[PDB]
């Protein structure tokens, strides 16, 4: 919205990602990329499955995901893709994020080489295993490839470790949701920012507010109503993700259209109830994540230590 704002005294401010350095150690020869099918495409950017010759081991090739722009992209999009590469180069490597493997910044359009996660996004994975879920396995043949409570607990734990990594790098996600979590071999979940590769206009999970489209049902109140995005507001989005996880990919606040009454109810203390398969101690974490006071929400470092005792 382009309007007036009354302000009150309360810090952190975004950095201009174009000012971040790009380390050319990530430069990978473009001629060693063999492109496959497009995995997903936004309005201006797309992620393509590809084969990278000698990227990690000089002997053999490996499947990777290459993030690139469409022909319709303008100079601002090309700057944005370069800034996304500069952020990934800045953050460093962690197991629970979609990591940067290389980049092609020469001899053509910019190609960002990321890890390929064979299972896709966690949201579609959960909704696919809905009829194949049991809390724990009793004859094991009947639950061959079943999803269990052990898996969901590991997912909550890995996403929390990934977010804890981002917070330690002074990085705010601002769009934490199951659709932005990817699953790869060994049930490893990886956080990522789709950025230019998700078409926000065609996704009902992003609500048209003014001129912007925001993931309202995942956002903390101070984000929706005060435009305040912090480490603590990410924790709110993690609580909404937990509700997705233990409802097996159900849309949050199911059956509630986003309108003025919805915003009012959230401000007055309205919260979702416990998912059907959520353990009690995990739902406790949800309620703390959804505290209207950002000071009373747990940090991701605390969430990691909390879930760790549950795993053990
Ligand atoms: C910063 O990094 C990023 O921003 C980023 C963004 C997306 C991906 C990524 C990095 N890394 C991946 O791997 C991504 C996806 N990968 C994938 C894998 C498997 C599938 N599935 C299940 C298929 O069936 C498709 N596919 C399987 C393999 N055969 C050969 C071809 C058909 C679908 C998507 C994917 C992309 C679009 C939307 C959701 C996820």
Angle between helices 280-289 and 300-311 (to 10 degrees): 180
Q: Are residues 111 and 173 in the same domain?
A: no
Domain-embedded: residue 265: yes
Tokens of 302: 């605390």
Q: What number of other Cβ atoms are within 10 A of residue 168's Cβ?
A: 14
Of ligand 1's atoms, which has the minimum distance to the CA of residue 37? Answer: 31
CATH assignment of the domain containing 26: 3.30.200.20
Tokens of 67: 């993030």
- How far apart are alpha carbons 64 and 47 in whole angstroms? 10
Domain-embedded: residue 225: yes
Q: Are residues 90 and 144 in the same domain?
A: no
Give pairs for 10-15: CB < 8 Å, separation 24+: 12/170, 12/230
Measured in degrees and rounded to the nearest 5, phi and psi for residue 268 equal -95, 5
Q: Are residues 39 and 143 in the same domain?
A: no
- How far apart are alpha carbons 179 and 237 in whole angstroms? 12
**CA of 184 relative to ligand 1 center, distance in Å:** 10
- How far apart are alpha carbons 297 and 165 in whole angstroms? 18
Domain-embedded: residue 6: no
Report angle CA 113, 99, 70 to the nearest 5 degrees: 35
Q: Are residues 158 and 278 in the same domain?
A: yes
**What residues contact residue 297 under an 8 Å CB cut-off, 6+ apart?**
232, 235, 236, 288, 289, 291
For ligand 1, atom 16: residue with the closest CA: 120
Cβ–Cβ < 8 Å for 47, 65 = yes
β-strand 120-121 against 181-184: which pairing, if any?
antiparallel
Q: Are residues 98 and 177 in the same domain?
A: no
Task: Select from 62, 86, 115 the last residue of a domain.
Answer: 115
Radius of gyration of the chain (CA): 20
Domain-embedded: residue 218: yes
Domain-embedded: residue 33: yes
Q: Are residues 128 and 274 in the same domain?
A: yes
Measured in degrees and rounded to the nearest 5, phi and psi for residue 27 equal -65, 125
Measured in degrees and rounded to the nearest 5, phi and psi for residue 213 equal -115, 120
- How far apart are alpha carbons 5 and 226 in whole angstroms? 9
**CA of 20 relative to ligand 1 center, distance in Å:** 27
Domain-embedded: residue 75: yes
For ligand 1, atom 12: residue with the closest CA: 116
Cβ–Cβ < 8 Å for 310, 279 = yes
If one counts the domains in the chain, the total is 2
The label of the residue with tokens 């932005």 reads: 180
Integer CA distances (angstroms), 181 to 62, 128, 262, 265, in order: 21, 15, 26, 28
What is the domain range of residue 196? 120-311
Task: Select from 80, 115, 150 the last residue of a domain.
Answer: 115
Domain-embedded: residue 268: yes
Q: Give how far the C-alpha of residue 44 lies from the chain's centroid of Cα atoms, to the nearest Å.
A: 19
Q: Are residues 79 and 145 in the same domain?
A: no
Cβ–Cβ < 8 Å for 174, 230 = no
Integer CA distances (angstroms), 74 to 30, 268, 276, in order: 22, 43, 46
Tokens of 106: 């020469």
Domain-embedded: residue 3: no
Q: Are residues 153 and 36 in the same domain?
A: no
Q: Are residues 106 and 136 in the same domain?
A: no
- How far apart are alpha carbons 295 and 286 in whole angstroms? 15
For ligand 1, atom 21: residue with the closest CA: 120
Catalytic residue annotation: 175
Per-position DSSP letters for the chain, written without gaps between them: ----------------GGGS---GGGB--GGGEEEEEEEEE-SSEEEEEEEEETSSSTTSEEEEEEEEE-TT--HHHHHHHHHHHHHHHHH---TTB--EEEEE-SSSS-EEEEE--TTEEHHHHHHHSTTSEESS---GGGGTT-EEHHHHHHHHHHHHHHHHHHHHTT---S--SGGGEEEETTTEEEE---GGGS-GGG-TTSEEETTEEE-GGGS-HHHHHH----HHHHHHHHHHHHHHHHTTSPPSSTT---SHHHHHHHHTT------TT--HHHHHHHHHHT-SSGGGSPPHHHHHHHHHHHH-
**What residues contact residue 209 under an 8 Å CB cut-off, 6+ apart?**
1, 216, 224
β-strand 147-148 against 133-134: which pairing, if any?
parallel
- How far apart are alpha carbons 86 and 80 in whole angstroms? 10
For ligand 1, atom 7: residue with the closest CA: 47
Tokens of 193: 């920012």
**CA of 116 relative to ligand 1 center, distance in Å:** 6
Resolution expressed in Å: 2.4
Q: Are residues 135 and 159 in the same domain?
A: yes
Task: Select from 115, 150, 167 the last residue of a domain.
Answer: 115
**CA of 172 relative to ligand 1 center, distance in Å:** 23
Report angle CA 229, 262, 300 to the nearest 5 degrees: 35
Q: Are residues 138 and 225 in the same domain?
A: yes
Tokens of 308: 């760790």
Q: Are residues 73 and 208 in the same domain?
A: no
Tokens of 231: 């480490």
Integer CA distances (angstroms), 172 to 82, 120, 157, 238, in order: 19, 23, 18, 12
Q: Which of 118, 182, 183, 200 gets mutated to test ligand 1 (max ligand atoms within 8 A of its CB)?
A: 182
Q: What number of other Cβ atoms are within 10 A of residue 249's Cβ?
A: 18
CATH assignment of the domain containing 235: 1.10.510.10
């Amino acid at each position: 919205e382009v309007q007036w704002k009354v302000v009150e005294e309360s810090n952190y401010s975004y950095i201009d990602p174009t000012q971040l350095p790009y380390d050319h150690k990530w430069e990978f020869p473009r001629n060693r990329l063999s492109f496959g099918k497009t995995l997903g495409a936004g309005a201006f950017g797309k992620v393509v499955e590809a084969t990278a010759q000698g990227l990690i081991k000089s002997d053999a090739a490996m499947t990777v995901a290459v993030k690139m722009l469409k022909p319709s992209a303008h100079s601002t999009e090309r700057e944005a893709l370069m800034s996304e590469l500069k952020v990934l180069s800045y953050l460093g490597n962690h197991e629970n994020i979609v990591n940067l493997l290389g980049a092609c910044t020469h001899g053509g359009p910019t190609l960002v080489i990321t890890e390929y996660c064979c299972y896709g996004d966690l949201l579609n994975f959960l909704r696919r295993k809905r009829d194949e879920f049991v809390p724990y396995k009793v004859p094991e043949d009947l639950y061959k490839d079943f999803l269990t409570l052990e898996h969901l607990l590991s997912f909550s734990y890995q996403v929390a470790k990934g977010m804890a990594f981002l917070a330690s790098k002074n990085c705010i996600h601002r769009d934490l949701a199951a659709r932005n979590i990817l699953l790869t071999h060994g049930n490893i979940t990886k956080i990522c920012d789709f950025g230019l590769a998700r078409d926000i206009k065609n996704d009902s999970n992003y609500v048209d507010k003014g001129n912007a489209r925001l993931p309202v049902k995942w956002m903390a109140p101070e984000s929706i109503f005060n435009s305040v995005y912090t480490f603590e507001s990410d924790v709110w989005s993690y609580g909404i993700f937990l509700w997705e996880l233990f409802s097996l990919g159900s849309s949050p606040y199911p059956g509630m259209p986003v309108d003025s009454k919805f915003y009012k109810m959230i401000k007055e203390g309205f919260r979702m109830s416990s998912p059907e398969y959520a353990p009690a101690e995990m739902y406790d974490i949800m309620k703390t994540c959804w505290d209207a006071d950002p000071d009373k929400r747990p940090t991701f470092k605390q969430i990691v230590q909390d879930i760790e005792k549950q795993i053990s």
